Design a protein around this ligand. Structure first.
Ligand SMILES: Cc1cn([C@H]2C[C@H](O)[C@@H](CO)O2)c(=O)[nH]c1=O
Ligand SMILES: Cc1cn([C@H]2C[C@H](O)[C@@H](CO)O2)c(=O)[nH]c1=O
Length: 251
């Protein structure tokens, strides 16, 4: 319902994406959803081409549920936090099921913005047949913030930023080496997003700048050859997205 549950369908164009071995630029339909109802907040999305990829972020309030004011310092609340990534792929081979679970919170910066932090431990199921499949592998720290800016062109301009820090994975150690002599995969990785979004009653446009450091744990510069000759992995660098979508809600 419009009250708390927010929906939106979007068309996204991406440029120089870095979660895989090779650089990519795609376009696709996306289904987004945000929600906040006393003991549960949520954010998630599903992408589909011109098979299916989705990432959901559900968190449950340890306060509301434990009916105890865990409030302390700038820490307004505490959550059982989750970050689940799923990629259907074309074969059980190009599939991914990742589950980050942990502790998350909301910070009060006294500033006119929203800020959240979450630490997760994760269990890895399918992962494109990589070495870290089916096992507890790595941790992740997620920091995200929302910053209302002003009213620009009749709509409302805002800034959304979030970064995912991953470390302690066992891949990279367990993967092989490249032609390069350097390991192919990586134990850690960073993906930082910066979003400038324009919102009207229903339509919205967003520009997204995104930076990877060893994207998808692919060790930057690793030299590989998938059968078309040697090439070097470009997993560290920028890429971006253009987003046009429509938010639904009765009047
Ligand atoms: C956010 C995210 C996206 N992706 C990639 C897979 C697809 O190339 C694309 C789908 O949005 O994003 C990952 O592999 N892992 C992630 O954690
Ligand atoms: C706003 C937001 C977007 N995204 C995703 C949705 C799109 O696939 C991409 C660019 O908006 O980032 C998140 O992963 N988390 C968020 O909180």
């Amino acid at each position: 319902l419009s009250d708390w549950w927010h929906q939106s369908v979007n068309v996204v164009g991406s440029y120089h994406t870095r979660f895989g071995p090779q650089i990519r630029n795609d376009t696709y339909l996306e289904y987004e959803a945000f929600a906040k109802k006393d003991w549960f907040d949520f954010y998630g999305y599903a992408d589909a081409p011109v098979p299916l990829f989705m990432e959901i972020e559900p968190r449950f309030s340890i306060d509301k549920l434990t009916n105890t004011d865990l409030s302390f310092g700038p820490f307004k609340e505490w959550y059982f936090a989750n970050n689940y990534i799923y990629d259907m792929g074309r074969n059980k081979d190009g599939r991914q099921s990742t589950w980050y679970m942990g502790l998350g919170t909301d910070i009060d910066t006294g500033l006119p913005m929203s800020l959240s932090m979450n630490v997760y431990a994760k269990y890895q199921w399918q992962n494109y047949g990589a070495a870290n499949e089916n096992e507890w592998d790595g941790y992740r720290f997620k920091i995200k913030y929302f910053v209302p800016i002003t009213d620009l062109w009749g709509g409302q301009l805002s800034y959304i930023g979030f970064t995912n820090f991953d470390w302690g994975s066992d891949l990279g150690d367990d993967s092989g080496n490249a032609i390069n002599g350097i390991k192919t995969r990586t134990n850690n990785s960073i993906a930082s997003s910066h979003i400038l979004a324009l919102n009207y009653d229903h339509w919205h446009y967003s520009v997204v700048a995104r930076y990877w450091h060893d994207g998808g744990q692919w060790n930057d510069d690793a030299e590989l050859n998938f059968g078309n000759g040697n090439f070097n992995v470009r997993s560290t660098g920028w890429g971006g997205y253009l987003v046009v979508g429509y938010n639904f809600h009765h009047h």
